[PDB]
């Protein structure tokens, strides 16, 4: 490949200036959402979010070095657990609420409007307070989304992947060297980091259920590219 | 078929 | 506190003496399974399992220390996921195979006796594979397993208490670079494997949730009846 | 809770 070269600088500079953009949701509509107008302004942003993700993988180091299908199959795993990380990390400046967009922050009470919601908000938001404890830097972000990709569907397959997931770990203890951060607070601070990971799959699964449970109850109709990474998951 | 084949190609 | 003045080898050593026994099935060799046999065969043993794995999360340095309440949430969360990663464990040695116990060695074709359950036979001896693959030892094992009891359920809860958590949990963060220290790992190898390890828990949580999906299927079907005991933490999931 | 009697004793 090429990207088990890159320096560690040069693997953070690579996936910083690969970030997606940060997208709006339609202008409006007015006073409390119901159930069906909730669903479908999310529904909609999702939809167009994960046409940047799936451009933003390609730009990320080692994954266009991967075959069609294996790139297929990670996508396919990770896209909640990478739309979530993604909502957390712009939440984290906004305590007790969501930054779905700039013009689309909600808290916990709206969670409310969707049936089995609020249990999903809740999860964010603790996931949002705990980046907020440990004063998680851009650069750690980007890291840790990068691998969520290349992790979540590793195990359900290998080789070149994981020399890629060292590679990543690399640049997270370079990243706390250079922070200040002493040998046993690294190892402390990259555990602590890599655990939260295991919470946003728990949240992933419990939300891709829901999602599941709003396509048979029809709520409101989802996007094809929705439903076929929806459908991925039996 | 698969729209994610052709946003991964595109 | 009582596990916050304790060195690395005392902590494993702690955490080895506390492990519980690998209990035997119900099973007789002398028949094929039905759906529900089978589930009924492994409700009895994850039933008996539970019992042990309470006993033991209270030996569990830092564990005791915790409140009641915080302590049926932690065991709640995470019970699945112990029996999962001690059934992953167990079937190390077994390459293509699942130990659930010494007189119970099932394969891939067999988890097809029951409905989708082929699925996550798939997902555990991939995690067996991965463990012989990086060469798992038992006193790595024994901390994972520890972590996950902490960990699974600490996002879900004055709350600190909380640092009392996460403090037991880099205590435990520590125990494994000092093993990898002495399997001559460098400080790279050490971070490398510690991350690799860690990954693991992400897919043992996948695990958990298809494979608690499947028994509450398996609940409102009235299929096969589970234990009073494994109702109750099955109910704690909200599914 | 079956689970509070277990942790109890
Ligand atoms: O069709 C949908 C797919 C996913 C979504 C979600 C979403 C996540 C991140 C994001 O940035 C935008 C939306 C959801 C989000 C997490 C779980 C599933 C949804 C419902 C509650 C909030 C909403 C609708
Ligand atoms: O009531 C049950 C609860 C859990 C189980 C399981 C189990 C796990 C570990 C173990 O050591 C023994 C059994 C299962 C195991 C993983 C997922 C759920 C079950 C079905 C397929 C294998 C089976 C029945």
């Given at each position: 490949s090429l990207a088990l070269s890159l320096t560690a600088d040069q693997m953070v500079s690579a996936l910083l200036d690969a970030e997606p953009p940060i997208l709006y949701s339609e202008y409006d509509p007015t006073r409390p959402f119901s159930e069906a107008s909730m669903m479908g302004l999310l529904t909609n942003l999702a939809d167009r979010e994960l046409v940047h993700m799936i451009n933003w993988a390609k730009r990320?180091?080692?994954?266009?070095?991967?075959?069609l299908h294996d790139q297929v199959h990670l996508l396919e795993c990770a896209w909640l657990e990478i739309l979530m990380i993604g909502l957390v990390w712009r939440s984290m400046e906004h305590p007790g609420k969501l930054l779905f967009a700039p013009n689309l922050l909600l808290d916990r009470n709206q969670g409310?409007?969707?049936?089995?919601?609020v249990e999903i908000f809740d999860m964010l938001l603790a996931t949002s307070s705990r980046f907020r404890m440990m004063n998680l830097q851009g650069e750690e972000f980007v890291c840790l989304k990068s691998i969520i990709l290349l992790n979540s569907?590793?195990?359900?397959?290998?080789d070149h992947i994981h020399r890629v997931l060292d590679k990543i770990t690399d640049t997270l203890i370079h990243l706390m060297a250079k922070a200040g951060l002493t040998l046993q607070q690294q190892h402390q601070r990259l555990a602590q980091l890599l655990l939260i990971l295991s919470h946003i799959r728990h949240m992933s699964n419990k939300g891709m259920e829901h999602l599941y449970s709003m396509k048979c109850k029809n709520v409101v109709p989802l996007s094809d590219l929705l439903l076929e990474m929806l459908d991925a998951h039996r | 078929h698969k729209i994610l084949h052709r946003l991964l190609q595109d």
């Open positions: 990320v180091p080692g994954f266009v070095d991967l075959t409310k409007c969707v049936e089995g919601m569907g590793v195990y359900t397959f290998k | -």
